[PDB]
Amino acid sequence: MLKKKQLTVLDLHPGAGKTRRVLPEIVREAIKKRLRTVILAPTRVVAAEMEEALRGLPVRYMTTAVNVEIVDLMCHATFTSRLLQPIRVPNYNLNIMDEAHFTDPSSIAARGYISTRVEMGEAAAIFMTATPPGTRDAFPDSNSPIMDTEVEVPERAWSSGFDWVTDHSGKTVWFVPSVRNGNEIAACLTKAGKRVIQLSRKTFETEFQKTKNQEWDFVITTDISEMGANFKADRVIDSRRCLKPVILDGERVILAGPMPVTHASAAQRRGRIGRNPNKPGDEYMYGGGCAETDEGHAHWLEARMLLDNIYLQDGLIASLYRPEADKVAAIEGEFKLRTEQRKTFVELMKRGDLPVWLAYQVASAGITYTDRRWCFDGTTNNTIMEDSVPAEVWTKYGEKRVLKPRWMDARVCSDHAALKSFKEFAAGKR
Ligand SMILES: Nc1ncnc2c1ncn2[C@@H]1O[C@H](COP(=O)(O)OP(=O)(O)O)[C@@H](O)[C@H]1O
Ligand SMILES: [Mn+2]
């Protein structure tokens, strides 16, 4: 697997031991061969788990998530961020991506960068995932048999007709299509006397610990838990539905759907259970079919925005990883920014915590990071609502204004927490 100019897809079925058994073997061999190696973990939670699997081995943990060399370990997003910034990144001879199905824009971009370096003959790479891009198998092998049942799954509060949900006496991981939908289901379950933990992208690294430290009956989670999150559960309830960010008329981003998940997403959701060879009969209840909803999904356009701004060699631009390259229609290099606008782009995404697409619109317009006039001078149909009335903030000048951004990205106000963060941004508070 370790030879140069080779990209290996390590696609053992879920729970087969890719992360805990195969990975340390790979690391020991890479150290013996003096290969400069990067290990890419999807989340800080997984990075901390990897330190336990890699205990003893000389690995530099480039994250504060690990309380503790020619092997570096960092998060997917950190790798892509460092490539975008002036910071020097080693030309790693061996690039290991764990949970390489992650569809975050930074993860897609990292796969494009790594796979291009391999294609140029400069490096080796190992992509670890049970569900490579394009998988059509929602029901892969597992360590113990799974009971699969197609069934109508509630997506709103319910009173009758779903007794099977609450009659269960084990622990359930329930994949919902959005934070707001999960809030409603959570409230309904809590009213029925269940103890519920909710997880989403921005709360995961913090709230996941409650699944170890607290008694719980349900974990209500968005698709973030598709990325190596381990639960001691015996049932998965899968709405089989997700929101799809879509760029409309090249001018705005909406959150379309909910709509079907990909086969890979469904397989990863189901793959939370059936992982213990000593506990057969975990249950997977699924509420819809699968479809290729990554086609036209904004994350792959946003990956091209990132990759267009990563230096590879002179003027060349890395391509997306071939199996996922057709999921976006874009002109190669069309998002490349000059030095100063690229710095603004990066700052809008990191400190600004704006979605990639929105950060690009602002930076490519020549706006500097601290200049928030664009948050207020949009068209009337770009007005953002809070509790059914136009949302308002005090500008950094002390004037109360309606939030009406020049470019509208639905992800800045899809839940209360997102809106709170964007209001603070519009006010100049970060
Ligand atoms: N902390 C742990 N202690 C013991 N076994 C674990 C632990 N975490 C995961 N496992 C088990 O180890 C096996 C392999 O896990 P893993 O390497 O994560 O599989 P994969 O990466 O192929 O999905 C699975 O059966 C999983 O349930
Ligand atoms: Mn794994």
From Swiss-Prot:
Residues 1-150 form the Helicase ATP-binding domain. Residues 3-6 are annotated as: Important for RNA-binding. ATP binds at L12, H13, P14, G15, A16, G17, K18, T19. The modification N6-acetyllysine is found at K202. Residues 145-324 form the Helicase C-terminal domain. It comes from the Viruses. Residues 1-430 are lumenal. It is a peripheral membrane protein. The record marks R269, R272 as: Involved in NS3 ATPase and RTPase activities. Acetylated by host KAT5. Acetylation modulates NS3 RNA-binding and unwinding activities and plays an important positive role for viral replication. It is found in: Host cytoplasm; Host endoplasmic reticulum membrane. Coiled coil: none annotated. A motif (DEAH box) lies at residues 98-101. Displays three enzymatic activities: serine protease, NTPase and RNA helicase. NS3 serine protease, in association with NS2B, performs its autocleavage and cleaves the polyprotein at dibasic sites in the cytoplasm: C-prM, NS2A-NS2B, NS2B-NS3, NS3-NS4A, NS4A-2K and NS4B-NS5. NS3 RNA helicase binds RNA and unwinds dsRNA in the 3' to 5' direction. Leads to translation arrest when expressed ex vivo. Disrupts host centrosome organization in a CEP63-dependent manner to degrade host TBK1 and inhibits innate immune response. Inhibits the integrated stress response (ISR) in the infected cell. Forms a heterodimer with NS2B. Interacts with NS4B. Interacts with unphosphorylated RNA-directed RNA polymerase NS5; this interaction stimulates RNA-directed RNA polymerase NS5 guanylyltransferase activity. Interacts with non-structural protein 2A. Interacts with host SHFL; this interaction promotes NS3 degradation via a lysosome-dependent pathway. Interacts with host CEP63; this interaction disorganizes the centrosome and inhibits host innate immune response. This is Serine protease NS3. It comes from Zika virus. The chain holds residues 1681 to 2115 of 3419 of the full protein.
